[PDB]
Write a protein that binds this ligand. Structure first.
Ligand code: I3P
Lengths: 739, 599, 83
């Protein structure tokens, strides 16, 4: 009990207790209660929860017995800080389905229904704190929460477990408790009215109307109890919260337009409308509940107007009038300390940068600290401290993730240009350096020295074998810094390692797996998911590898000599196609897929593709041109179809996109004399449109005022593309001839 | 042994809870059922044409799907249409290019039904009709993205990347659904003994049985299962089998038409079966091979039997219900000099010889139905000698005709069952609902208009389909429709009490029947005469709201002979009497139309 | 005891007798009858009896905790799932 109170409302204690989580991973009701409290109102822990915790809880429920503490823990896990966790819902549903019928029990048979009624009347006064009745209620709520997420299979399974007829039969019985009624209504709302299944049985069926008249009866009893001072809080919450939501969901859906066609349904709709009209009259309702009631009334009223329903004059006038009306000193010390803390932090912030920058400078030349002529000085002069740092970084990967990350970040700062921290920072840096120690060319020398140490091997080793995203990202960043400026020595070192090392297959596989996940996330977008952000560094690293016209590296990116080859070249093309929408994007709807956020990534993909082709390498050009994804059409559509939605507020991005696309197309056939490349592009392109866009670019001088890339320059590049194409198409040659 | 190839025609045999081939219900039904009692590997089902699936490569549907959603502004729709057509063309060329490639484990394939030309697909959103837990599996014409099916090993011997071998047990995992196909144990209420196929986690294994290879699928050679008709060049008559006196008899039908080749008949359609050691295997036919001929309309097998009276015909051709006996084996003898014993060319003259008896089939000028006016049935015999003046041309058949025959045969069988059930005395609500569904389907079939929700009773035909009308008459379905009219009024249902809402469902069924009769006859004399032969029953039922009067007026409006012969003073008395009882202007219009025929 | 296993695999001290002769049946389609490739799946059949070896789930050492020995038998029919 002390532990539960300690980690009550403060995530800091919850994380602190989670540090020793393995203590509580044992059978026991008290342990389960503590586990529930720890993961209560904590999105970070709920999202970070791993498979073993959920699997262990499911196992205990299946084997230990039928208990609610497990269900309680699962329910808090799914919902945290008002936002559902999709991964937790899917995992829980899968485990429940795989566990069997022991964990999931539903009373649907005639004997089971009689058994439900027998317990239901027994617990008429109230629900016991430990009984199978509330176990079923918790299970129903748990399934409803799982079905809330967007997963078609989960909703189908939930619908199968509890059919519509069963809900109607259980609820309609006079001997029914409010707790089960609210749970079943919530389950129906989360599964039937709101569902991705195309069956939509609820919207077209007579079963729901039974619930509607039961809801009308429940509201009638509630208001009568209010008049008689026999108000029951449970019933009030029932009608106010879930009944209103269920009514709103059905009658506000677009599939309910044809649902109400018969007279019986019309009368029932009238009964509901008048019932809520009576409810709003009473003053006991609160503002929070009034809004929900008003929303239901408004939804019902508009449905009435659309269907031209006939209502009694007395209540019809009242409803219309209501609708019109709605439309028309310890504190001093504590605060003082806070200001001092903020002031000190701001004042001392610049010096921290200088102090950290001393670390990299020390790592640059550790020799100075040791006395001249000693063994340590000789070892430090030729590698030594740095050499051991690279070698032992690989060993410590599993031992300490944070230490490796810090080492990589320090190494990246080593390979980065120095910056002026400030007057105070400069003075501190100078003082520290004197106490301790007594340019593109410089960057190139530093990169070569680190490569000699084994940085390239370390980066390859980190990338191929790593289960931590941060370490992989840091390794990619270090590689980009090492290759920055198109250094040939680093590029050759990567080539030698890839050929000699037998683990290059894993490197290509992980990149391939990472690439596909980005495409799937990009496809699912129809803000940015984690996969796409990590997409850009991989492309940048590949581009730097192919920098300075490296033919062999470009060939290895396309295909290698190993057993199973992954062609990284077309993955960028496929990703671009899906990002822009693929075929539909290039059919005139290009502007509906490119937003301000993703322009930069698209530019990087196009630039990377251009560097692949600008060998001049024929294999890459044919591979991209002849690829089955039809990425040429979208690439051409970029030049032809201007991105109007983006041009309204940002034209420079559009021009840069146009410029990069033109460069890529030029590289696609820059050094090709065969017409196959020209034929495919011409098929995707339209000669009449090409001359038109060229004319518009010539006349697009209006926006040249605030254009980093002149529209004239891209227009000329397109013309050169057209001229190169005229050699194989007679029609394009004819139009391109000026009068 | 051989490796599975793209384009091969194979049959999938589910091994697990239910052991049987996968087939599809006839008519328009898109459900797939596994029938354990139909047959096994040793004894394939009699109707093996439903169990054949062709393997096709992946076909992208992103452009097609975007079109369909947008349909379900004008310039945008046209642009989407152009892309979908381009996508369809890109798919078509890809299949041709990929044709002949080996199928490897872990690859995606599409299964296409030969009889229905529909892809087998899985819809994740919609659950199965019977088992709510599982997903829905159905046949789709165009095929959505669910058509893709990963072919995965079921044995630990095979591994990913290994070529698929014929006879290997494999698991078909849909790309999107992610749950392997499963032959459910839930018996279908509509058809007894038929199970259901749905996508759900299971241990079911599908065995790949080869029926025909891609190389042998050439359209220029005779192949097992082809629907062809045998034409007698000498007598210029088509081989046919029909019921004459309660027994089915084979003969040559005499045709009064100027062009004999144009006398196509639904009962003259035969199916060629190539007999091999493996019953499941089919393949192309060779000159030296053995063949079997099956009647599609009935399913009997052509054979020979002792002549009761012996004449020059020692053995007379007859149809036997079962073809497993050696008496149904036949050999093809070329008329011209062919190159060795290679594939039999399509549309080539051949002579049929009886292996068991070693005799050559001959045509005789002795009618079977001598005791009738203008006999049209000619007996076919066999003699030990060879007659070089006689052969049987193998005339091909269009795909439309075979599809129509299957529809007509299935509709006739159910209607016969419905007639028997009505004749018994009691019919359940479900059975009559199915009958009504079948009747409206037949009404659409005869009319041929697309089904878009328009009322079946109120429908017009700009150009009647002669082929379907002839099939309607020949398959005895019109006789079944007449039986449905006769048995109830004999009582299960009374005409005078039809107005009651209790009998409302029957009224609709009778209305549908007359619509079939009305749509069956249009600008065709033979159908009009056949229907008018039962004028007594229709005349007796006039007056009740069953649309009987409309059918009578339409039938007699364009036929002077029937109008003069049938309409005597009695019918005029009935019409005027009904006018007096109803005082309805409609009856006046019917009389006015009756007065003047053909303007 | 005969069960579906008519004949049981056992070890004989001397191999000169024909009872120890075995053929190898390839699982996949090999090129004619050339050399058996190394690391290939094969099925063992008894020449003297003309039967195919099958695996059974009946433990030999039933009278002990957690039996680990599984009997191997032969049947006239061929099981393509075993190699
Ligand atoms: O042009 P009409 O007056 O209709 O006459 C047609 C034809 O001349 C024959 O009477 C008959 O063919 P057969 O005698 O050869 O059968 C055919 O019926 P069919 O459709 O049953 O062949 C008729 O439709």
């Amino acid at each position: 009990q002390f532990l539960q109170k300690f980690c009550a409302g403060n995530p800091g204690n919850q994380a602190l207790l989670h540090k020793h989580l393995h203590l509580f991973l044992t059978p026991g009701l008290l342990e389960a209660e503590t586990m529930q409290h720890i993961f209560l109102n904590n999105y970070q822990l709920c999202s970070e929860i791993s498979e073993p915790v959920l699997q262990h809880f499911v196992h205990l429920l299946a084997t230990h017995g039928r208990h609610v503490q497990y269900l309680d823990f699962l329910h808090t896990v799914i919902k945290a800080e008002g936002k559902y966790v999709k991964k937790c819902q899917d995992m829980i549903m899968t485990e429940l389905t795989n566990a069997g019928d022991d964990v999931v029990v539903f009373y649907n048979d005639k004997a089971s229904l009689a058994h439900l009624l027998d317990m239901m009347k027994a617990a008429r006064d109230g629900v016991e704190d430990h009984s199978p009745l509330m176990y079923h209620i918790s299970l129903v709520d748990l399934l409803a929460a799982c079905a809330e997420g967007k997963n078609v299979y989960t909703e189908i399974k939930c619908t199968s477990l509890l059919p519509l007829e069963d809900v109607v039969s259980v609820v309609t019985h006079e001997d029914c408790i409010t707790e089960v009624k609210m749970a079943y209504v919530n389950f129906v709302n989360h599964c039937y009215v709101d569902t991705e299944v195309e069956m939509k049985e609820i919207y077209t069926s007579n079963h729901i109307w039974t619930l509607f008249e039961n809801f009308t009866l429940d509201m009638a009893r509630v208001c009568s109890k209010r008049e008689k001072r026999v108000a029951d809080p449970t019933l009030e919450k029932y009608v106010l919260s879930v009944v209103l939501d269920t009514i709103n969901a059905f009658f506000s859906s677009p599939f309910s337009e044809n649902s109400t066609s018969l007279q019986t349904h019309q009368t029932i709709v009238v009964q509901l409308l008048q019932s809520t009209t009576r409810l709003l009259e009473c003053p006991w309702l609160q503002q929070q509940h009034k809004g929900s009631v008003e929303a239901c009334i408004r939804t019902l009223a508009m449905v009435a107007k659309g269907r031209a329903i006939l209502l009694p004059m007395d209540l019809d006038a009242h409803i219309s009038s209501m609708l019109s009306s709605g439309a028309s000193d310890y504190k001093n010390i504590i605060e003082k300390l806070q200001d001092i803390i903020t002031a000190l932090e701001e004042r001392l912030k610049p010096l921290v940068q200088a102090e950290l920058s001393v670390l990299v400078d020390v790592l640059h030349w550790p020799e100075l600290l040791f006395l001249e002529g000693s063994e340590a000085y000789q070892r430090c002069e030729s590698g030594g401290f740095l050499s051991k740092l690279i070698q032992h970084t690989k060993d410590l990967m599993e031992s300490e993730e944070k230490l490796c990350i810090k080492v990589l970040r320090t190494l990246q700062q080593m390979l980065l240009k120095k910056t002026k921290y400030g007057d105070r920072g400069n003075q501190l840096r100078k003082m520290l350096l004197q106490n301790y120690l007594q340019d593109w060319s410089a960057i190139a020398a530093t990169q070569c020295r680190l490569d000699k140490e084994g940085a390239t091997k370390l980066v390859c080793d980190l990338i191929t074998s790593t289960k931590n995203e941060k370490i992989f990202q840091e390794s990619i960043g270090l590689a980009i810094h090492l290759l920055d400026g198109g250094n040939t020595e680093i590029q050759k070192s990567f080539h030698n390692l890839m050929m000699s090392d037998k683990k290059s297959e894993r490197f290509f596989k992980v990149l391939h797996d990472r690439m596909k996940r980005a495409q799937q996330e990009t496809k699912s977008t129809v803000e940015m998911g984690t996969s796409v952000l990590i997409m850009q560094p991989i492309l940048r690293f590949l581009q730097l590898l192919c920098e300075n016209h490296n033919r062999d590296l470009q060939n290895f990116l396309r295909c290698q000599n190993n057993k199973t080859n992954y062609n990284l070249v077309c993955e960028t093309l496929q990703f671009l196609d899906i990002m822009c929408g693929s075929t539909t994007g290039g059919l005139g709807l290009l502007g509906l897929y490119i937003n301000e956020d993703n322009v930069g990534l698209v530019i990087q993909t196009l630039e990377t593709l251009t560097e692949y082709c600008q060998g001049p390498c024929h294999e890459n050009q044919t591979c991209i041109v002849t690829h089955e994804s039809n990425g040429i059409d979208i690439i051409t559509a970029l030049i032809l179809n201007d991105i109007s939605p983006l041009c309204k507020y940002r034209m420079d991005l559009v021009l840069q996109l146009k410029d990069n696309a033109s460069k890529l197309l030029l590289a696609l056939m820059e050094s090709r004399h065969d017409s196959e490349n020209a034929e495919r592009i011409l098929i995707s392109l339209r000669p009449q449109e090409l001359v038109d866009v060229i004319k518009k670019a010539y006349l697009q001088e209006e926006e040249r005022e605030n254009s980093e890339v002149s529209p004239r320059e891209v227009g000329h590049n397109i013309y050169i593309l057209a001229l190169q194409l005229s050699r194989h198409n007679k029609q394009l040659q004819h139009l391109l001839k000026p009068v | 042994s051989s490796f599975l190839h793209i384009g091969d025609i194979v049959s999938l045999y589910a091994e697990g809870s239910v052991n049987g081939f996968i087939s599809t219900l006839g008519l328009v039904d898109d459900r797939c059922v596994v029938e354990p009692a139909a047959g096994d590997l040793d004894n394939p089902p009699k109707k093996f044409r439903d169990c054949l699936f062709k393997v096709c490569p992946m076909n992208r549907y992103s452009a097609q799907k975007q079109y369909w959603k947008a349909k379900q502004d004008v310039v945008l729709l046209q642009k989407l249409q152009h892309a979908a057509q381009m996508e369809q063309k890109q798919n078509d060329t890809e299949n041709k290019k990929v044709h002949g490639d080996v199928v490897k484990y872990g690859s995606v394939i599409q299964l296409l039904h030969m009889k229905s030309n529909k892809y087998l697909t899985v819809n994740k959103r919609l659950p199965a009709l019977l088992e709510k837990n599982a997903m829905r599996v159905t046949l789709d014409a165009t095929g959505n993205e669910g058509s893709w099916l990963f072919i995965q090993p079921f044995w630990k011997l095979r591994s990913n990347g290994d070529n698929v071998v014929v006879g290997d047990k494999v698991i078909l995992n849909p790309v999107n659904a992610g749950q392997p196909l499963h032959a459910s144990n839930y018996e279908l209420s509509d058809n007894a003994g038929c199970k259901e196929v749905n996508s759900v986690n299971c241990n079911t294994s599908w065995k790949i049985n080869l029926f025909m290879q891609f190389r042998d699928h050439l359209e220029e050679v005779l192949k097992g299962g082809d629907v062809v008709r045998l034409f007698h060049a000498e007598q210029e008559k088509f081989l046919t089998c029909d019921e004459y006196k309660g027994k089915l008899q084979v003969f040559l039908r005499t045709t009064l038409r100027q062009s004999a080749t144009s006398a196509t008949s639904s009962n003259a359609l035969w199916e060629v079966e190539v007999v091999h050691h493996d019953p499941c295997r089919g393949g192309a036919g060779h000159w030296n091979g053995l063949y079997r001929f099956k009647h599609l309309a009935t399913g009997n097998y052509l054979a020979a039997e002792e002549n009761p009276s012996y004449e020059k015909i020692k053995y007379c051709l007859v149809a036997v219900p079962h073809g497993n006996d050696i008496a149904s084996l036949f050999e093809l003898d070329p008329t011209t000099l062919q190159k060795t014993d290679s594939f039999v060319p399509r549309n080539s003259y051949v002579r049929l010889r009886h292996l068991c008896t070693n005799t050559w089939i001959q045509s005789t000028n002795v009618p079977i139905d001598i005791e009738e006016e203008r006999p049209i049935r000619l007996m076919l015999g066999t003699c030990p000698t060879k007659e070089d003046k006689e052969a049987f041309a193998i005339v091909s058949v269009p795909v439309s005709e075979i599809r129509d025959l299957d529809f007509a045969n299935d509709a006739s069988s159910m209607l016969a069952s419905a007639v028997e059930k009505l004749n018994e005395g009691f019919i359940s609500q479900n059975d009559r609902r199915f009958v009504i569904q079948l009747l409206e389907d037949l009404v659409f079939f005869v009319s041929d208009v697309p089904n878009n929700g328009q009322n079946v009773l109120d429908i017009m035909v700009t150009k009647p389909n002669r082929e379907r009308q002839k099939l309607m008459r020949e398959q005895n379905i019109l006789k079944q429709v007449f039986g449905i009219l006769k048995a109830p009024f004999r009582p299960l249902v009374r005409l005078e009490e039809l107005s009651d809402q209790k009998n409302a469902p029957y009224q609709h069924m009778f209305r549908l029947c007359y619509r079939v009769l009305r749509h069956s006859q249009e600008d065709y004399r033979k159908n009009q005469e056949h229907i008018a032969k039962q004028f007594g029953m229709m005349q007796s039922q006039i007056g009740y709201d069953i649309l009987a009067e409309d059918t009578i007026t339409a039938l007699l409006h364009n036929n002077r002979k029937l109008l003069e012969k049938h309409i005597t003073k009695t019918e005029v008395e009935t019409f005027v009497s009904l006018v007096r009882k109803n005082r309805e202007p409609r009856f006046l219009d019917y009389l006015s139309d009756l007065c003047v025929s053909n303007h």
